[PDB]
From a paper:
HPV E7 is composed of three conserved regions (CRs): CR1 at the N-terminal end; CR2, which follows CR1 and contains the LxCxE motif; and CR3 comprising the C-terminal half of the protein. Unlike CR1 and CR2, which are known to be unstructured, CR3 forms a homodimeric domain structure whose monomer is composed of two α-helices and two β-strands, in which a zinc ion is coordinated. PTPN14 is a cytosolic PTP protein and constitutes a tumor-suppressive p53–PTPN14–yes-associated protein (YAP) axis that controls the Hippo signaling pathway.
In this study, we confirmed the direct and potent interaction between the two domains and determined the crystal structure of the PTP domain of human PTPN14 in a complex with the C-terminal domain of HPV18 E7. The resulting dissociation constant (KD) of the interaction was determined to be 18.2 nM, demonstrating that they interact with each other with remarkably high binding affinity. Next, we attempted the crystallization of the PTPN14 PTP domain in a complex with the HPV18 E7 C-terminal domain, which consequently led to the determination of the complex structure to a resolution of 1.8 Å. The PTP domain of PTPN14 contains a central twisted β-sheet composed of eight β-strands, which is surrounded by seven α-helices. The HPV18 E7 C-terminal domain is composed of two α-helices and two antiparallel β-strands, in which a zinc ion is captured by four cysteine residues provided from two CXXC motifs (C65CKC68 and C98PWC101). The intermolecular interactions between the two proteins are mainly mediated by α1 and β1 from the HPV18 E7 C-terminal domain and β5, β6, β7, and α4 from the PTPN14 PTP domain. In detail, intermolecular hydrophobic interactions involve Phe90 and Leu91 from α1 and Met61 and Leu62 from β1 of HPV18 E7 and Lys1043 and Phe1044 from β5, Gly1055 from β6, Trp1070 from β7, and Leu1026 from the β3–β4 loop of PTPN14. Additionally, Arg84 from α1 of HPV18 E7 constitutes an electrostatic interaction with Glu1095 from α4 of PTPN14. The interaction of HPV18 E7 does not induce a dramatic conformational change of the PTPN14 PTP domain, as its structures in the apo form and in the HPV18 E7–bound form were well matched when superimposed with a root-mean-square deviation (RMSD) value of 0.93 Å over 276 aligned residues. Moreover, the conformation of main and side chains of the phosphate-binding loop containing the catalytic cysteine residue (Cys1121 of PTPN14) and the tryptophan-proline-aspartate (WPD) loop containing the general/acid base aspartate residue (Asp1079 of PTPN14), both of which are critical for the catalytic activity of the PTP protein, are not notably altered upon binding to HPV18 E7.
Numbering used by the authors:
A (entry chain A), B (entry chain A): 893 to 1108, 1113 to 1185
C (entry chain B), D (entry chain B): 55 to 103
Write the structure that this text describes.
Amino acid sequence: MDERFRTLKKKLEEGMVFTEYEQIPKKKANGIFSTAALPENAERSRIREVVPYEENRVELIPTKENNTGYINASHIKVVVGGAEWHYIATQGPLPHTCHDFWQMVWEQGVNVIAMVTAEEEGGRTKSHRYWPKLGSKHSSATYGKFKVTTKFRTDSVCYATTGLKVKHLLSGQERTVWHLQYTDWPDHGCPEDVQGFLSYLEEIQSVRRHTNSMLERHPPIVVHCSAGVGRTGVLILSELMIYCLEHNEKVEVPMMLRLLREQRMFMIQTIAQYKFVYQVLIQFLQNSR
Amino acid sequence: MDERFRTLKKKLEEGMVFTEYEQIPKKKANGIFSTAALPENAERSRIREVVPYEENRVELIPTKENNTGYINASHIKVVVGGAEWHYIATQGPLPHTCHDFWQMVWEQGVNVIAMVTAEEEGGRTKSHRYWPKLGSKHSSATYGKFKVTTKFRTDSVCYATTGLKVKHLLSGQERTVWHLQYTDWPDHGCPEDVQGFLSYLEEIQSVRRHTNSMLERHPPIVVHCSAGVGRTGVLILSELMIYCLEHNEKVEVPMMLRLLREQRMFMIQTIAQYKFVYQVLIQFLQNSR
Amino acid sequence: EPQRHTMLCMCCKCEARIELVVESSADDLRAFQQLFLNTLSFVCPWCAS
Amino acid sequence: EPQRHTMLCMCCKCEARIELVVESSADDLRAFQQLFLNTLSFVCPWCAS
Ligand SMILES: [Cl-]
Ligand SMILES: [Cl-]
Ligand SMILES: [Zn+2]
Ligand SMILES: [Zn+2]
């Protein structure tokens, strides 16, 4: 990895990494958003401008109230080193889409939710509280067909890990979901504590392997912020590039970003977020030495 | 097992089970006790009359203070249904044999100790306290080369389960030992609560399988009372016969007792203890229906 | 080396919040978390008496 | 069905005895016991503050 460290540093000194970012199109030219564009689905998107492409939107089982099975969520699939990676990138649930969110968690067999935001930041709502509070109403809450119970919370410095039980109220089936919330992102800009963000990635990686071992397969993890493209893109790009470096795949960061944008529009929406990813990778490589 | 239940009941009604017990010799005719008989080893036996046969005594690594590696303990080995069972039957440690006891636990790779007695009963000492008290001196105690630490105790109605860590003070190696103490045996006679004794056997069986799974082999469990023949014999005979019934081996109880007596003199020393075993087996079979 | 962690949970009898403070390795912390997602529940001191 | 069990242990900071009362299945009780034999230790309330 010493050659990988020196290579990355050189590229950052060449003065073109921000140049090439500007030239990455923010979204597909001939992109189709048929279901997201329907007027019945306008109120289901937190940010009207940020919606899934039709070909890889997460499709829910239809219901009478949601007949197109629409949720603002995309399947993100990347193959790195013979390994398929699967994420669902989604927006922070709205008060009236919490039952949709849990329906998606159920149908997709999700074990891990990575929430890269607080509920409210600087007065503005980023996500509805879609999981219960400990000690409030038997630590339980019901969202449509799904009864969710909080069983524990472990606070770390930069993030909190919450264990949830999810019960399907018609079948009675119970399942476990791990809720990993990054708590250190500032109200504007990017976090100054890069190491703390790396600790959060560490916890995601660790909980994914744990839940995979319990099911003795590899479902997507759900990643969400407010619109599901900015901080969500930072997390996904960082994890994919860290794995690329750890197993020495010759993929350039802008190439990976182009592939993510092929699957969800606007992923990583500022140059500051893109530069943050590079500092995450630099810190990961420094940690190795 | 319904045929096994009816068969056992019939035999108990035939009036000969106590007759055949009296005719079982208490010990081998041409028995040899060379090491136990040495005057240097007189003080190492709690009951002078109860000692191991030479051929299957538990031999310790010699030390300057204990050059014959003597402990009052016997290897009890029985094959039932293609399965070898291995016990060490031993006396309750004396104040000056606690280091011998832990040396035996170490050399034999013992994971489970079944203590079928209280330390003092009716004023008379039955066993030295050879494991630490919680909260007393860092919950630790040292016996020769072995530092023992108590990590937890779980009290049940009829028995207590204590988890111990054992550290070899020269190598630094640490190991786990589970200490299972039956607390319901009366000061004289046999326990009236047969179900509680069955619960204790249940815990022994459960902890043996747990410790075997952790070592992902099958060491002996240590069973001791005061002299290591009476209540110890009740426990061992009961477990062997319960397994015989559960896997439908045609071994008669007096035949099994004869084989145990071939390996340690005086095993089951009263008719009341022998009749208690039968009531344990009756209750186990009633539990099945 | 073991680190200090705090586990927040609910009493299984009375809805009161319980704060457990442990020191352990990361692997034993995860194993302990998993027990709450199986059947393990704690009883607060009041409900215990 | 889960049963009530009491776990006695020692604070890893001050030698005081800690009484933990849980309800759980037998298997989860054994798993919890095993954690004490690995690295899991509890901190008493006083040492926690
Ligand atoms: Cl630049
Ligand atoms: Cl008779
Ligand atoms: Zn309570
Ligand atoms: Zn303390």
